[PDB]
Structures are given as structure tokens and as C-alpha cells.
């Protein structure tokens, strides 16, 4: 599933993201559009053979199991084909733990380096919240 903008924004406000570990909502918002372009379907292979999936990326190396990522971990306890899906519950819930984990978003490196320090609330703006 590709979200519209405004339509991740009201999922993930409803899954309680919005201010999770004092990250605002448009903060999820733009890491989600420049991890998945907002596509729920999103997958790309990792230099150490790792996999991210999902809207969020989420990293076969520590969150997830995909069975092809020897050495592993899976924090979030769930087959990484979960993170696929066009209901975006199994993300945003292992997404919780990811970022509490002691280095809030910066976990994610698209977060990082496009949207961190930005003006992250253009993401909802418009939007019927
Ligand atoms: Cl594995
Ligand atoms: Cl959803
Ligand atoms: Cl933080
Ligand atoms: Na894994």
C-alpha cells in the first residue's frame, strides 16, 4: 500500500506515534517518506545481507526475522514480512521499541540526515487531525 500523506499521518497518530519518546508527529511522517516513500510494500537489501522492510525500514539485523540474516536478532518478535503489510500496526509497534532503545530516531539515517533539524510539521500540515 502507498499512504497518502495526510492518511499515514492520521494511522500513525491512531497507533499512538504522535509524540512517542517526544518525537512529533511530521517527525515519523518524513522519515517514513524518505525510508518508503510511504510504501508499505518498501524493501531493500543491506551491504551485510540484512533486509529493511516496510515503511520504516526496519532491520532484519536486530528487529525482525526473515530467516536470511545469519546472526541475527529479533527484538520485535516478527517474521519481517509482518512489516509489509497495508496495515502498519506490526511497524509502528516494533518502531516503539526501536526508538527507545537509547538513541531515539537517529536510527534511522534517512531521520537523520533529511529530517532532523528541519521544519518536520510541513509533514501534517493540511492535515484533518
Ligand atoms: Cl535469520
Ligand atoms: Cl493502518
Ligand atoms: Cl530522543
Ligand atoms: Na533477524
Given at each position: 500500500?502507498?499512504?497518502?500523506?495526510?492518511?499515514?499521518?492520521?494511522?500513525?497518530k491512531?497507533?499512538?506515534?504522535?509524540?512517542?519518546?517526544?518525537?512529533?508527529?511530521?517527525?515519523?511522517?518524513?522519515?517514513?517518506?524518505?525510508?518508503?516513500?510511504?510504501?508499505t510494500?518498501?524493501?531493500?537489501?543491506?551491504?551485510?545481507?540484512?533486509?529493511?522492510?516496510?515503511?520504516?525500514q526496519?532491520?532484519?539485523?536486530?528487529?525482525?526475522?526473515?530467516?536470511?540474516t545469519?546472526?541475527?536478532?529479533?527484538?520485535?518478535?516478527i517474521?519481517?514480512?509482518?512489516?509489509?503489510?497495508?496495515?502498519i500496526?506490526?511497524?509502528?509497534?516494533?518502531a516503539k521499541?526501536?526508538?527507545?532503545?537509547?538513541?531515539?530516531?537517529?536510527?534511522?539515517?534517512?531521520?537523520?540526515?533529511?529530517?532532523?533539524?528541519?521544519?518536520?510539521?510541513?509533514?501534517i500540515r493540511?492535515?484533518?487531525?
Amino acid at each position: 500500500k502507498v499512504f497518502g500523506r495526510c492518511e499515514l499521518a492520521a494511522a500513525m497518530k491512531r497507533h499512538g506515534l504522535d509524540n512517542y519518546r517526544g518525537y512529533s508527529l511530521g517527525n515519523w511522517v518524513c522519515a517514513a517518506k524518505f525510508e518508503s516513500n510511504f510504501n508499505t510494500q518498501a524493501t531493500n537489501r543491506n551491504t551485510d545481507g540484512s533486509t529493511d522492510y516496510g515503511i520504516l525500514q526496519i532491520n532484519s539485523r536486530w528487529w525482525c526475522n526473515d530467516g536470511r540474516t545469519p546472526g541475527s536478532r529479533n527484538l520485535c518478535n516478527i517474521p519481517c514480512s509482518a512489516l509489509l503489510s497495508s496495515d502498519i500496526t506490526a511497524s509502528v509497534n516494533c518502531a516503539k521499541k526501536i526508538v527507545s532503545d537509547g538513541n531515539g530516531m537517529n536510527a534511522w539515517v534517512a531521520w537523520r540526515n533529511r529530517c532532523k533539524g528541519t521544519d518536520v510539521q510541513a509533514w501534517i500540515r493540511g492535515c484533518r487531525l
